Structures are given as structure tokens and as C-alpha cells.
Amino acid sequence: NFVMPRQRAVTVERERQAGKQRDAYYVTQRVNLQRYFANGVVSGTYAAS
Amino acid sequence: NFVMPRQRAVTVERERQAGKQRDAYYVTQRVNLQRYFANGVVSGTYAAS
Numbered sequence: 001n002f003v004m005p006r007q008r009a010v011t012v013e014r015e016r017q018a019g020k021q022r023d024a025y026y027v028t029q030r031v032n033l034q035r036y037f038a039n040g041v042v043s044g045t046y047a048a049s
Numbered sequence: 050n051f052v053m054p055r056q057r058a059v060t061v062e063r064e065r066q067a068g069k070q071r072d073a074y075y076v077t078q079r080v081n082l083q084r085y086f087a088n089g090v091v092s093g094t095y096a097a098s
Contacts (some may be wrong), residue, residue, distance in 0.1 A: 015067040026067055 001040060004033045050089050055080040 007030040016023045035041075057079035065072040084090075 013067045013070070015069075018067075024067075026069065030069060 001036050002033075003035070004031065006031050050084045050086060051082070052085070053080065053082055 010027060010029045013026050014023060057062045063076040
């Protein structure tokens with residue numbers, strides 16, 4: 001348990017035409033952390049009032 | 050009469066750098082339908098309450 005399924009790597013695209021005097025850098029990433037079943041975890045917590 | 054005048058048959062364009070992560074497809078055609086003289090057609094009409 002605790003796998004991080006990954007659709008793709010990080011990518012970079014760039015755009016400057018038909019812009020106005022300006023290179024633009026765009027980056028994207030699709031990643032998520034999602035566990036299977038609810039077992040084997042704690043917080044703690046650890047609290048005041 | 051009822052000639053089909055045209056100056057641009059169908060053009061299919063394509064952009065992807067960058068659109069902000071979104072391709073764009075553009076389709077255009079330049080055409081018209083026009084008659085030399087005001088005669089040669091009737092419409093019914095076929096109308097009542």
C-alpha cells in the first residue's frame with residue numbers, strides 16, 4: 001500500500017509567436033498519491049486546548 | 050441562373066504552440082449562391098390559420 005500512480009513525466013512547452021516580445025515557458029505534470037485500503041496509518045495528534 | 054460562385058474551397062488549419070496546452074483546428078470556406086435575374090423560382094406557402 002501507498003503507491004503513487006503516474007500518467008506522465010513533467011514536460012515543458014514554449015510560446016512566443018504570435019506574442020508580443022516575450023518568451024513564455026509552460027510546464028505540466030500529472031501525478032497523484034492514492035492508497036488502496038484504509039489500514040496501516042496514524043496521525044498523532046498530539047494536541048493542546 | 051442559380052450559379053455557385055466561390056473564391057476559396059475548404060481549408061483546414063491546425064495550431065498547437067501552445068494555445069496554453071490546447072490545440073485549435075480552424076475550418077473555412079468562401080462560397081455563395083446567386084441568381085442573374087429575379088425569376089425562375091416559386092414558393093408554396095401553403096399558409097393558413
